[PDB]
RNA sequence: AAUUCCUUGUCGGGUAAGUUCCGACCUGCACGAAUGGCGUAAUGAUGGCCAGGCUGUCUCCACCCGAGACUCAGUGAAAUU
RNA sequence: GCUCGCCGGAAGACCAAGGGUUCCUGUCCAACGUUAAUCGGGGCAGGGUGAGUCGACCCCUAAGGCGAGGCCGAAAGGCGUAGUCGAUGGGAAACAGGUUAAUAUUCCUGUACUUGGUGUUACUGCGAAGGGGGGACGGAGAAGGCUAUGUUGGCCGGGCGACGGUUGUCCCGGUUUAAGCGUGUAGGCUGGUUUUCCAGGCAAAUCCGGAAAAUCAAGGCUGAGGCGUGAUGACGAGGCACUACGGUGCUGAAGCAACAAAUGCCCUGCUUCCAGGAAAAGCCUCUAAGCAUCAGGUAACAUCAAAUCGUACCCCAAACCGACACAGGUGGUCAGGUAGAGAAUACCAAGGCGCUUGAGAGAACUCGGGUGAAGGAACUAGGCAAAAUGGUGCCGUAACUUCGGGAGAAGGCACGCUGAUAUGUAGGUGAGGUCCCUCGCGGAUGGAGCUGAAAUCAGUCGAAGAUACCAGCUGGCUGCAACUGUUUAUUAAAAACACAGCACUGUGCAAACACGAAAGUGGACGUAUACGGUGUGACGCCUGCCCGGUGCCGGAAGGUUAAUU
RNA sequence: AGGACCGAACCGACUAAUGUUGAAAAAUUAGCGGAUGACUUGUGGCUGGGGGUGAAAGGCCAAUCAAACCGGGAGAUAGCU
């Protein structure tokens, strides 16, 4: 059966991406979130 | 000519086609060729602003001159050609000085025969003339609104308006709809009908064939929930309201011009 | 009647026997003409009914071939309490 | 290692996506592996990914995104012009052989090709964000010419048989060779060349377009394959010296023809149809502003440069998506033999596997199958399930019908093998030879060789010849919906939803309407034979009476009536 | 020629059995429907929650839908257990 998850690295950087997140102010205000809480990981970049 | 498919099959029984054997069987112009993607009903919102609009087959677009400007350079048609973006056809044009341009075709027209516009032309159908010059109840199509901005009325397969009246200033014409409507006596307007006469006589005859044009099937809305269609509801078929519009119009009588910018032009609307 | 409560209406057909089915009757509880009426060839993994063929569906089960079940060795759960 | 079994339009081979060292070697067996484990996609260590030509990057653009100014909006922000991004598309060039434990069109050998920079020489009108051409495009169908590939023969090497026969019409294996360059064929498209003129292509133009004359009919473009060269090479079944029986040097015969033949190529062609079938750049031309014994342009030669990143391995799966080493899901490419219409099906080749607990026993019962006396739907809500029908050819085929259908209606007959007609026929293919020529990949004749149905007659074996797999049950009455389609992913596939058709109604274009505080966008680059909404639902015969109620569309005298005053 | 016919790939999901702490949070096996089209499929793009999309089932919108998910108001309120 078809999973909900069909994995695709230009769509995942293209939605999730640090530059995706950049472009937007509520994007930017989710990094500033993450950079509080100490992720070590911020976005999906890589 | 009109022509009744033997019924081999189902979807074939009912279907009516229009063979036009002096359409060009060819490719068309490409210098008058431009993209044209469509839009499956969306605006640039992206939402379905108008619902019913979707597929069909790839089209291009064809620049058709809808002004007739160049006045006092004799034209020949060279070939009638389909064009898939409109209900009439349209005639390749040769021009004295070695122009092409495409225009709607009008009901007698062929290969060879010669057009003219400008204040000076014959009134021959296909020629274009300021309304002033064109004598009063005189068949024409393509006609001007506003002097300078190309025809607006009378484009469709065979439709056409009437000179009824020269106020001086201003021209009466009685469109195809009924409407008694007058215009500056400055708008350029094509003698003649535009001939595609048998286009309503077509009978698709199944369903793909509506899928082809781009038609999208039609949910009536009393198939549909209330929370859908204010016709939605009931055990059955019930439709206990007033018809009306998703959105909450009557759509039985109700009227919805309410323009009242012009509020002059018209005179007799219809019926 | 995809509509009929009384109702398995009545009559006829089909069966040795038919609350279903088919054809009529009209007393239409409570059909009806584009929320369409009545017909309709073709079409349908559609509903109902009757035949020929066919058979373990059945009278009534019998035997056989394989995978489990059973025994030995290894690994080793679960609901519940 | 020898047997056996399974897949073989894959359960083989190569990739994309995705994963990210799972690849190779050594070593280890705690945990991981549904058991053991010396083994592993496990632990540990080392090794492994070599490009001017493959891909990315790059040039170009589609949907779409972003968007200097700008328009709009309480703020946030929205839309959008010029622009700039964005492949799933367009744009220069490498093939064969050899080689590593693990990479190769990347290394090596051989033989090629493309785009730029610089320099020299000769000859020269060069020049763009502009103009034109080109790029550049649909569905279906039809053949014809080819190749991949296969079969047979010939040729070459080997073989003479564990059990009767096997020196022959016998058996096994091999018979392979690219890009590039030259030739320009089957076939497709198009009439050429020259002069003069012109309201067009934002200005210009020798280019494109248009007009008028003159002159020849042969010009040009596109084009699979074949042939030649590449190749006195490479490869090559098998042998001979080394040979840790793990493997390397050298040597190495034949290497042809016929026939069959694609869904691949000619073909972005041709014919035909309506639903009428991307864009831009590279590329080829045109000149403008400008630059002119310069600079630039064309050609030859020489020289230099072609960076950077990816390249291991899995990739219908134990490595991706499913919590698992999970009977699931996952796009593209390659497509052998016999039978067959076939990529179905059966058995096989190349190749890959036996699915990570086994060993016994041969109870009930469950699961998946085989057969069955007599009866044959008596079963049951219901013929659920099972059984049955099943192919080709010929004969034959009802009511009804919209004249197409119904229809493969129903039903009946014949099917193997051998011989003959005919030592292999009709047909297909086509050599040598002759003849012709503008002699060429030519035309005619010619028929060797090869290949090869189908039918008739006669004979013959079995219970059975469409023997296996494969492969319609049929008919009668009737409700509903016309029909093909669509739907509750995961208990409802239907009489429901669509549907062509029909009707009413709105809509004159800055259309109605819809999404938006707005700008604006869709409707539509459409214009009443158009578009939106509503109901009905092919077709046939039709669609009656009622406007009091509610709604809608008109009306104007009167009454009542808001802010305001 | 055909929303033509038979039938693989491909896309579907009508019937039955099995399975139901399954091999699988919908599959397997034997049959079944469409299979040149209103077809199917790869890659990318657009539509956002009282909104989308919907050949219309209240279907679908990340195993969640008569108003998704995550965080916050929030220790909502609970005359009820």
């Known amino acids: 059966m078809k999973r909900t998850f069909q994995p695709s690295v230009l769509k995942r950087n293209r939605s999730h991406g640090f530059r995706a997140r950049m472009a937007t102010k509520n994007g930017r205000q989710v990094l500033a979130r993450r950079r509080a809480k100490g992720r070590a990981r911020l976005t999906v970049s890589k | ?271």
Not at chain 2, 121 to 140: E, F, W
Not at chain 2, 186 to 214: I, P, Y
Not at chain 2, 234 to 257: D, I
Request: aromatic share 4%.
């Open chain 2, 1 to 271: 000519a009109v022509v009744k498919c033997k019924p081999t099959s189902p979807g074939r029984r009912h279907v009516v086609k229009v063979v036009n054997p002096e359409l060009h069987k060819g490719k068309p112009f490409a210098p008058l060729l431009e993209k044209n993607s469509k839009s499956g009903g969306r605006n640039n919102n992206g939402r379905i602003t108008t619902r019913h609009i979707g597929g069909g087959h790839k089209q291009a677009y064809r620049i058709v001159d809808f002004k007739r400007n160049k006045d006092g350079i004799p034209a020949v048609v060279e070939r009638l050609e389909y064009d898939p973006n409109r209900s009439a056809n349209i005639a390749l044009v040769l021009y004295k000085d070695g122009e092409r341009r495409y225009i709607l075709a009008p009901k007698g027209l062929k290969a060879g025969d010669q057009i003219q516009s400008g204040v000076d032309a014959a009134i021959k159908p296909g020629n274009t003339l300021p309304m002033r010059n064109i004598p009063v109840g005189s068949t024409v199509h393509n006609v001007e609104m506003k002097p300078g901005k190309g025809g607006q009325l009378a484009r469709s397969a065979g439709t056409y308006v009437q000179i009824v009246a020269r106020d001086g200033a201003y021209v009466t014409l009685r469109l195809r709809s009924g409407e008694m409507r007058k215009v500056e006596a400055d708008c350029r307007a094509t003698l003649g009908e535009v001939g595609n006469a048998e286009h309503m006589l077509r009978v698709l005859g199944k369903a793909g064939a509506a899928r082809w044009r781009g038609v999208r099937p039609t949910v009536r809305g009393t198939a549909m929930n209330p929370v859908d269609h204010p016709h939605g509801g009931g055990e059955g078929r019930n439709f206990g309201k007033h018809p009306v519009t998703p959105w909450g119009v009557q759509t039985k009588g109700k009227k919805t011009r309410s323009n009242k910018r012009t509020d002059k032009f018209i005179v007799r609307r219809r019926s």
